[PDB]
Design a protein around this ligand. Structure first.
Ligand SMILES: [Zn+2]
Ligand SMILES: [Zn+2]
Lengths: 232, 232
């Protein structure tokens, strides 16, 4: 039960958007997760060992594998608990997961598959170097909503003390069965779905020690906590 | 280069002082590091594969291995950078280390061996269940100084974004060659030493998923950042 993370949310938010790991390299550590590409281009969804990408132009494709990522979270999903849910809001769905998870003091992974009455996502717009704080991208991000759509939500829960390294609470992405729509979930309403949870005993954090920008950078985390809450 | 850590400092500060891992389990992950025992009793020093423990009563011994620890940091030490230092105070030595390490944005381990003009350590007084904020223990901790003493300082550096998960910057312990004096370093002045630094590419964080307390606990981190600047 290990959650693998390449880079961190706080450092990404700080403006270090250079791709430092390969999609293929990430897949070596898991089959379910979330991420983004160099320049924080779009939304990466790791689903069933495959890597998908939804960008700011409503495009949706399966990544070749050589694309680079500045921040990614992945795991070899092994559900330790499964249970259904119907006709519930995002808040109510999270409250259920909060009830079924082993502990909110631990990291955990979730998978929600089925039909969604409502789905609301954003596709982080890509930046070109020199980079700026990621909050600037989020403030001009496109958002797309759908209704009565079938797909899967995948993500992770980060415990309080780890806010910054990961995200404050749930961080989830969506990919529809048609593999034509998806992104970072901002809101949703389940119609009929199945929820799978996995509690982690180990958190493996990897750093891009070979990336000169990261190594030499003087990272400013001023207001990073507040920005993360506005951006995601 | 993997830095292994069982539990977190922030959680320890909150009061969860129950022993959730043994000295032996930790030695399986390294030969150089720091820790404390159940109830945050004293200062554990992992040096050259052996685990030493100095308590509030000035007792310095070699743990048997079955003792439990609530928080621990350890690594299979391998120097990435080696260099000498002479006649320098703690502040000047830390500055040199920050200059010689690969990046202040990474975790790193240090081993400073040789003679020290001055050595000032403290031995965290133990607490008995039920436990309270570890800050109260530091507010009545013993402290012993020495002069012209040969030994080794071993510890870790924690990048900014990880303050809380680990300490804020340097966290070092000491143990003399005579193995009869040591503890948490509060200050020092090197006479003639050699410094070895290990730059970490991976941070492995382990959690006590079987510790009911930790699992069901509603950990309060309010003001934890400031209590570490005081207690550390
Ligand atoms: Zn996202
Ligand atoms: Zn200490």
């Amino acid at each position: 039960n290990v959650l693998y993370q390449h880079g961190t949310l706080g450092t990404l938010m700080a403006g270090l958007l250079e791709g430092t790991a390969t999609i293929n390299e990430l897949l070596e550590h898991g089959n379910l997760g979330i991420a983004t590409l160099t320049g924080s281009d779009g939304e990466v969804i790791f689903l069933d060992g495959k890597a998908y990408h939804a960008n700011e132009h409503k495009e949706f494709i399966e990544l070749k594998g050589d694309e680079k990522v500045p921040y990614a979270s992945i795991t070899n999903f092994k559900a330790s608990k499964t249970f259904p849910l119907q006709q519930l809001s995002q808040d109510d769905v999270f409250a259920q997961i909060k009830n079924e998870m082993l502990s909110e003091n631990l990291f955990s992974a979730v998978k929600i598959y089925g039909t969604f009455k409502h789905m609301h996502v954003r596709m982080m717009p890509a930046q070109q170097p020199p980079y700026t704080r990621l909050i600037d991208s989020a403030r001009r991000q496109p958002e797309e909503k759908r209704q009565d759509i079938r797909g899967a939500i995948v993500g992770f829960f980060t415990p309080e003390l780890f806010h910054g390294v990961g995200s404050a609470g749930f961080h989830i992405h969506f990919a529809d069965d048609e593999r034509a729509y998806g992104g970072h979930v901002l809101d949703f309403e389940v119609d009929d779905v199945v929820v799978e949870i996995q509690n982690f005993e180990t958190f493996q954090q990897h750093f891009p020690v070979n990336n000169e920008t990261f190594v030499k950078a003087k990272i400013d985390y001023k207001d990073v906590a507040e920005e993360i809450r506005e951006a995601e």
